[PDB]
Amino acid sequence: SWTYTAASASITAPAQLVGNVGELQGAGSAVIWNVDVPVTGEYRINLTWSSPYSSKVNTLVMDGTALSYAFAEATVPVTYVQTKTLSAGNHSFGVRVGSSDWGYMNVHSLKLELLG
């Protein structure tokens, strides 16, 4: 069980680091993280955010895959559950903005556990 705050990730403009929390906007923004997976299995991922304003539809880039996840921006550290299979080695995790699905959202931190 290890987390990686946005203060250590890659804030790609329009992404901005607002209080150890990313800040994506139009297309092109991206909050990617650099890490490695211990083994080859399905880990329990959870996204956390805290943007006291508002957001919009967005894409969840976890392990290279981008799932369509639309939402706003809450001030409270709201968490979400997401299970997916990851491989051993180096991978790219994060949350970016797509063309069809865009929304200015802040990124608190990406979490990845061993699925219970």
Automatic annotation (TrEMBL):
Superkingdom per UniProt: Bacteria
Subcellular location: Secreted
Full protein name: mannan endo-1,4-beta-mannosidase
Species of provenance: Cellvibrio japonicus
Biological classification of the source: Bacteria, Pseudomonadati, Pseudomonadota, Gammaproteobacteria, Cellvibrionales
Gene: man5C
